[PDB]
Design an enzyme around this catalytic site. Structure first.
Site, PDB file in Angstrom:
ATOM      1  N   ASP A  27       0.849  -1.193   0.000  1.00  0.00           N
ATOM      2  CA  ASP A  27       0.000   0.000   0.000  1.00  0.00           C
ATOM      3  C   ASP A  27       0.894   1.256   0.000  1.00  0.00           C
ATOM      4  OD1 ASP A  27      -1.741   2.122   0.501  1.00  0.00           O
ATOM      5  OD2 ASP A  27      -2.913   0.986   2.018  1.00  0.00           O
ATOM      6  N   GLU A 119       1.067   3.093  13.096  1.00  0.00           N
ATOM      7  CA  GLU A 119      -0.008   2.792  12.149  1.00  0.00           C
ATOM      8  C   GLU A 119      -0.943   1.778  12.804  1.00  0.00           C
ATOM      9  OE1 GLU A 119      -1.197   0.483   8.910  1.00  0.00           O
ATOM     10  OE2 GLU A 119      -2.553   1.583  10.263  1.00  0.00           O
ATOM     11  N   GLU A 128     -10.192  -3.517  15.238  1.00  0.00           N
ATOM     12  CA  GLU A 128      -8.984  -3.965  15.965  1.00  0.00           C
ATOM     13  C   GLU A 128      -8.800  -3.297  17.322  1.00  0.00           C
ATOM     14  OE1 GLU A 128      -5.266  -4.415  13.634  1.00  0.00           O
ATOM     15  OE2 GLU A 128      -6.442  -3.912  11.835  1.00  0.00           O
ATOM     16  N   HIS A 279      -5.450  -0.150   1.094  1.00  0.00           N
ATOM     17  CA  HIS A 279      -5.860  -1.468   1.521  1.00  0.00           C
ATOM     18  C   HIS A 279      -7.062  -1.404   2.484  1.00  0.00           C
ATOM     19  CE1 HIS A 279      -3.703  -0.919   5.326  1.00  0.00           C
ATOM     20  NE2 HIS A 279      -4.244  -2.053   5.732  1.00  0.00           N
TER      21      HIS A 279
HETATM   22  N1  SAH Z   1      -0.583  -3.400  22.144  1.00  0.00           N
HETATM   23  C1  SAH Z   1       0.310  -3.656  21.194  1.00  0.00           C
HETATM   24  N2  SAH Z   1       1.639  -3.713  21.452  1.00  0.00           N
HETATM   25  C2  SAH Z   1       2.525  -3.995  20.486  1.00  0.00           C
HETATM   26  N3  SAH Z   1       2.188  -4.209  19.201  1.00  0.00           N
HETATM   27  C3  SAH Z   1       0.899  -4.155  18.814  1.00  0.00           C
HETATM   28  C4  SAH Z   1      -0.148  -3.870  19.795  1.00  0.00           C
HETATM   29  N4  SAH Z   1      -1.328  -3.888  19.161  1.00  0.00           N
HETATM   30  C5  SAH Z   1      -1.069  -4.135  17.874  1.00  0.00           C
HETATM   31  N5  SAH Z   1       0.264  -4.330  17.671  1.00  0.00           N
HETATM   32  C6  SAH Z   1       0.922  -4.574  16.390  1.00  0.00           C
HETATM   33  O1  SAH Z   1       0.803  -3.371  15.623  1.00  0.00           O
HETATM   34  C7  SAH Z   1       0.961  -3.645  14.242  1.00  0.00           C
HETATM   35  C8  SAH Z   1      -0.098  -2.869  13.456  1.00  0.00           C
HETATM   36  S1  SAH Z   1       0.072  -2.926  11.696  1.00  0.00           S
HETATM   37  C9  SAH Z   1       1.443  -1.819  11.436  1.00  0.00           C
HETATM   38  C10 SAH Z   1       2.773  -2.546  11.163  1.00  0.00           C
HETATM   39  C11 SAH Z   1       3.963  -1.620  10.859  1.00  0.00           C
HETATM   40  N6  SAH Z   1       4.109  -0.555  11.902  1.00  0.00           N
HETATM   41  C12 SAH Z   1       3.768  -1.001   9.518  1.00  0.00           C
HETATM   42  O2  SAH Z   1       3.454   0.204   9.398  1.00  0.00           O
HETATM   43  O3  SAH Z   1       3.885  -1.707   8.509  1.00  0.00           O
HETATM   44  C13 SAH Z   1       0.857  -5.164  14.152  1.00  0.00           C
HETATM   45  O4  SAH Z   1       2.154  -5.683  13.796  1.00  0.00           O
HETATM   46  C14 SAH Z   1       0.342  -5.648  15.503  1.00  0.00           C
HETATM   47  O5  SAH Z   1       0.782  -6.945  15.920  1.00  0.00           O
END
Ligand code: SAH
Ligand code: SAH
Ligand code: O3S
Ligand code: O3P
Lengths: 337, 337
Positions: A27, A119, A128, A279
């Site tokens: 994306d 993100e 989520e 996405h």
């Molecule tokens: N409480 C929490 N502590 C740590 N990681 C978390 C979380 N809640 C969600 N995540 C993680 O946050 C991510 C969101 S998606 C974003 C992924 C990456 N920062 C990017 O921009 O490509 C996922 O990998 C998920 O496992």
């Protein structure tokens, strides 16, 4: 029967697979928006410390290093943290980006940070429920006056006629011309199946599917005191608009944008159907059946986004609406699996 | 596996056929639907004034084609709630005295008489997913007159090694990240390979000629009138295969597909081959744990068995053993996604 530890296990295991990160990094609108939002905030980041909440494959943390951050804490609860560590080491940034496994709520940083990047946005913005993790991190780890990237989010709604759905409903009347059997009588059935459920459908629309001027129904300033409590109670509000023309109205689309502070000027990442595809697509709220609208047909209503009762990571949408002179109706939706 | 009884599994299987989407996809599949339409009409001579059992009538379409071929009486047996839609399509086409919709499994339904012909579209992904064939054979034994017509009459199964161009693009994605974003993620190729190839699921995907590395080999032939075919299905159907690769390529695994044959006129073949017009069945892909480089004339051989899974007898299992060149023989055990 699903407990909090089991729910979080399943939620994080989903982010341990390659496909979801491939989709996110493919994306370009998303990933360039973060890259450019980060680089435009160089002055606030250069020589400073950053927490990347949910670092995934490590990509945003590395953008922050590239902007000049002294140190970045890349926190990630899914097993994908192992991939992030490998990527950091592969780019020669072990000394500048520290990958920390586990939930951000319980992680131990050696210091508070000058900035948070994340993100965290799901389908419909809040699917989520990751925003509470970002806010928890802000309260616990972000210095007074520190920088939050993005800084705000806005939610929009509009009535729609989904072209793809219209073809799918019209299919049954076309059987006669294709195969010489009349199945036009299954239209009602196709409608019950495709529109009569109470699931939020994630599907990309075009501007030609939009039947009115989009209306902003909520604004979330991430630094606002009491935002945690708002998310739990529900966010949203009333809306009203007027349709452009004759169309079979199928329901509503919602989408969001998030805004990064400027250096320069403020960068907006948008998921509107009038803007380049992401996405996230849009989140569609279908009526039980189509309603014919016309130029200047009044459409009004009220919407609340809230966590589901039995799964707090599952978005629920409560909708009240009125189309023209039809009576006010309600519909209660939950995010599709 | 979470335990479900036979009755519960059957209920869940039929409930999935109660929704419009699968019937839309089937009827929209022109290659499939015209094969049956023409296979039926070409057999006007055996169907004029005769009686037909449609095993799994669905929305009633094949039953109506049979009436249009001059059938005197058609029994449209359907175990899913979609029988109600069939009943309405028949009434709407003015055929209620000729097509009789009977609800329930063909195994327990009572016809007033034996029939002159059976028509059925029973084929699943990889031919035998769903395990519907045993129901058609059950109906043959119980209801089809000696010398009766079976539409289609036979099925054949094919295998070939593949280099999936789409998969190769997905695996190479991580090496292209540096070009778009200035972050080197080429070290995640191994991870992507484990995720996309290392699992034991059959993947249903449409290929073309560019993906095929050798001459396809027939590995099984199912003559539906063959005594004890029922027993073969339970024990497993399949056979050995061998072929020689065309050129240099990363081999990803195998595709399987099928065709079925209608008696003529001359005989009509409904094919799901990647060299033939696309169908909703696509092909069924069996990936190796990782790519293997092949060359012109690299020998690829093995043995493949298709059988019911142990926990769910409607879920296709594939037992593969294979050898590429002078690599040691390997095995892999797949189940339908
Ligand atoms: N409480 C929490 N502590 C740590 N990681 C978390 C979380 N809640 C969600 N995540 C993680 O946050 C991510 C969101 S998606 C974003 C992924 C990456 N920062 C990017 O921009 O490509 C996922 O990998 C998920 O496992
Ligand atoms: N044992 C059984 N008895 C009756 N119907 C069955 C069955 N097993 C499967 N079916 C039905 O068989 C159908 C297969 S799909 C084919 C549908 C239709 N004849 C058409 O060509 O469009 C499904 O509707 C399924 O519910
Ligand atoms: C509904 C029960 C079930 O699981 N059926 C099944 C499984 C996988 C795919 C399909 C499917 C999807 N689109 C069409 C179809 C049916 N098709 C394979 C032909 C069946 N005769 C159905
Ligand atoms: C755990 C779980 O069910 N995750 C979840 C749910 C639904 C979709 C997705 C998804 C598909 N493609 C990319 C994503 C992530 N997007 C939304 C951005 C997240 N910041 C992720």
């Amino acid at each position: 029967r699903r407990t909090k530890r089991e729910r979080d296990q399943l939620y994080y295991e989903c982010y341990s697979d390659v496909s979801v990160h491939e989709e996110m990094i493919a994306d370009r609108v998303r990933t360039d928006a973060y890259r450019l939002g980060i680089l435009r905030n160089w002055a606030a980041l250069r020589g400073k410390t950053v927490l990347d909440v949910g670092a995934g494959t490590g990509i945003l943390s590395i953008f922050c290093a590239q902007a000049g951050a002294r140190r970045v804490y890349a926190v990630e609860a899914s097993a994908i943290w192992q991939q992030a560590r490998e990527v950091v080491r592969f780019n020669g940034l072990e000394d500048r980006v520290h990958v920390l496994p586990g939930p951000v709520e319980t992680v131990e940083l050696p210091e508070q940070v000058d900035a948070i990047v994340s993100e965290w946005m799901g389908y419909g913005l809040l699917h989520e429920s990751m925003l509470s993790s970002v806010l928890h991190a802000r309260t616990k780890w972000l210095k007074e006056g520190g920088l939050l990237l993005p800084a705000s989010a806005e939610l929009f709604i509009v009535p729609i006629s989904d072209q793809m759905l219209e073809w799918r409903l019209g299919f049954w009347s076309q059987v006669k011309q294709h195969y010489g059997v009349d199945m036009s009588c299954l239209e009602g059935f196709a409608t019950r199946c495709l529109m009569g459920h109470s699931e939020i459908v994630v599907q990309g629309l075009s501007g030609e599917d939009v039947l009115a001027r989009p209306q902003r129904f909520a604004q979330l300033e991430l630094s606002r005191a009491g935002l945690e409590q708002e998310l739990e109670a529900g966010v949203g509000g009333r809306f009203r608009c007027s349709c452009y023309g004759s169309a079979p109205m199928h329901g509503f689309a919602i989408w969001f944008q998030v805004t990064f502070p400027g250096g320069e000027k403020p960068l907006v990442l948008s998921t509107s159907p009038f803007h380049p595809a992401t996405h996230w697509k849009q989140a569609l709220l279908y009526l039980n059946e189509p309603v014919q609208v016309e130029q200047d047909t009044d459409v009004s209503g009220e919407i609340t986004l809230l966590p589901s009762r039995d799964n707090p990571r599952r978005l629920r949408v409560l909708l009240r609406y009125k189309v023209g002179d039809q009576e006010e109706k309600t519909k209660d939706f939950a995010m599709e699996d």
